[PDB]
Coordinates of C-alpha atoms in Angstrom, one line a residue:
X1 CA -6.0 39.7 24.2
X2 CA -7.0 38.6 20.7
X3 CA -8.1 35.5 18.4
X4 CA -5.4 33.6 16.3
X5 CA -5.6 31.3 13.7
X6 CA -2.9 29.1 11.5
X7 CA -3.8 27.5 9.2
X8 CA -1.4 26.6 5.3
X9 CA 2.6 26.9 5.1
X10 CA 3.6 25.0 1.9
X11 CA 2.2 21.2 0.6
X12 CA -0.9 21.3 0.3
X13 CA -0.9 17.7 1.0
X14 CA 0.1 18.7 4.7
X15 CA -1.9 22.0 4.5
X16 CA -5.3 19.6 4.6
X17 CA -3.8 17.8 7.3
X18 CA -2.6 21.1 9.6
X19 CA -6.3 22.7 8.7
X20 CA -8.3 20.0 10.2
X21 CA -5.4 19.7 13.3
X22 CA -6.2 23.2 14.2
X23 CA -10.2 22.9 13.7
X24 CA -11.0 19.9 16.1
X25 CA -8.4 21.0 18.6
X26 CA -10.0 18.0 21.1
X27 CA -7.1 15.3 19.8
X28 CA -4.6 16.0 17.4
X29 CA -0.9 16.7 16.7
X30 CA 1.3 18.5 14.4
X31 CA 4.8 16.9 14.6
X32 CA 5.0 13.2 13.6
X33 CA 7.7 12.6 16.8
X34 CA 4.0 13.2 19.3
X35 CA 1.8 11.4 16.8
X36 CA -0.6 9.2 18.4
X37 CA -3.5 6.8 17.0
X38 CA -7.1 7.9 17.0
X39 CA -10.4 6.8 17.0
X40 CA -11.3 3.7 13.8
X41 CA -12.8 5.7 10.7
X42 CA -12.0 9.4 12.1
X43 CA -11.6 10.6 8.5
X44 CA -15.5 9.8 8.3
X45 CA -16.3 11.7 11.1
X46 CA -14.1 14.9 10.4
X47 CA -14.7 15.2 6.9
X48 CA -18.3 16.5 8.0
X49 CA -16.5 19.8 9.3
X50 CA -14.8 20.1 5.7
X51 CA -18.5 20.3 4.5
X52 CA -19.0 23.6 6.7
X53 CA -16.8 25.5 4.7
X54 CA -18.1 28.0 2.6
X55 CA -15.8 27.5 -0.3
X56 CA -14.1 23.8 0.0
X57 CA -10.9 23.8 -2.2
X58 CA -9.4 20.8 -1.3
X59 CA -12.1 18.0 -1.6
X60 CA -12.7 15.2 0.6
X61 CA -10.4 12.5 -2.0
X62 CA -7.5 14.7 -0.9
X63 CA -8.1 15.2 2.7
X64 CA -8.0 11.3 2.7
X65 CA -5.4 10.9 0.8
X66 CA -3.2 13.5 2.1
X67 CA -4.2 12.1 6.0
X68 CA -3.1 8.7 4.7
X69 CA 0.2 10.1 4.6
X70 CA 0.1 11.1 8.3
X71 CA -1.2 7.4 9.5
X72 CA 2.2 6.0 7.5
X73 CA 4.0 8.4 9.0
X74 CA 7.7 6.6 10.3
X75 CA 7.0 8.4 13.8
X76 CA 3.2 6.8 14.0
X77 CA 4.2 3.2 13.1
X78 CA 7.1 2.8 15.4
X79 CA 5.1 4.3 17.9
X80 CA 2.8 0.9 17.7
X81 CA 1.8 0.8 21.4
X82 CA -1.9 -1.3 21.7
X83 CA -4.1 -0.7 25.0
X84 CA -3.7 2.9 24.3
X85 CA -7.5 4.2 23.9
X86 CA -7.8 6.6 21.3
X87 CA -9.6 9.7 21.3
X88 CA -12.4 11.1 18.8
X89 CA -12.9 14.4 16.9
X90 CA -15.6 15.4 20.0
X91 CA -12.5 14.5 22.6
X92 CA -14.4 11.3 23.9
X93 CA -12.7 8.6 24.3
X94 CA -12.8 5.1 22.4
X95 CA -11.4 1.9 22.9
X96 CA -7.6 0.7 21.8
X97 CA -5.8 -0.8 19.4
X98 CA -5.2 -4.5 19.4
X99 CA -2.0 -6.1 20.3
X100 CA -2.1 -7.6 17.1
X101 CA -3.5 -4.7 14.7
X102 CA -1.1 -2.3 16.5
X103 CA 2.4 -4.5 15.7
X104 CA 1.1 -5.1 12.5
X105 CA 2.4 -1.5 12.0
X106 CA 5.9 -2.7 11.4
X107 CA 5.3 -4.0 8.0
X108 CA 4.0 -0.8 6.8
X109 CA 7.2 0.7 8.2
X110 CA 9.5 -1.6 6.6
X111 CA 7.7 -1.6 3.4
X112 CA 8.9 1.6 2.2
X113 CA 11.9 2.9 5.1
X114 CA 12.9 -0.8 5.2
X115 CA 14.1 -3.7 3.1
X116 CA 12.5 -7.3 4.1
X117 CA 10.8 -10.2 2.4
X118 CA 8.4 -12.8 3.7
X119 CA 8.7 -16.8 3.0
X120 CA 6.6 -19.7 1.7
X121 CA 5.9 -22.7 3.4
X122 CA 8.2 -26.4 3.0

């Protein structure tokens, strides 16, 4: 009967990303495979528990950057699936992704794990 925490392993790209996993424990996931989408502009509202800290290390251009990695993630793109509401840092829930926005996806998936061009008009 005791507290736990777990929090850093090695990149610290992913360490920003596993810190704030752990903190707002509401909607989140560690594995890519179980990656879902959440709530529009979440970074926003998350980077306010980053300010808490007594000694931020990491600052908020990293955390960004570093969860940018996360939303291009092989896992999350594939995984476009629209009508899906999303969740917030507080657990509630929001509304979903587009049918359009959601597919869209695909491109940022085959832009850098695929090889495909677009065409010009006649």
């Amino acid at each position: 009967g005791s507290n736990q925490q777990l929090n850093a392993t090695k990149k610290d790209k992913l360490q920003v990303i596993d810190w704030l996993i752990e903190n707002f424990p509401n909607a989140f996931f560690k594995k890519g495979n179980q990656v879902k989408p959440l709530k529009i502009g979440i970074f926003d509202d998350l980077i306010d528990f980053y300010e808490r800290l007594d000694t931020p290390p990491f600052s908020k251009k990293s955390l960004r950057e570093a969860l940018s990695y996360y939303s291009a993630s092989p896992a999350y793109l594939s995984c476009q699936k629209p009508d899906t509401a999303r969740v917030d840092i507080y657990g509630n829930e929001v509304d979903v992704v587009t049918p359009e926005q959601a597919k869209y996806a695909y491109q940022r998936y085959q832009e850098r794990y695929g090889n495909k061009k677009s065409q010009d008009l006649k």
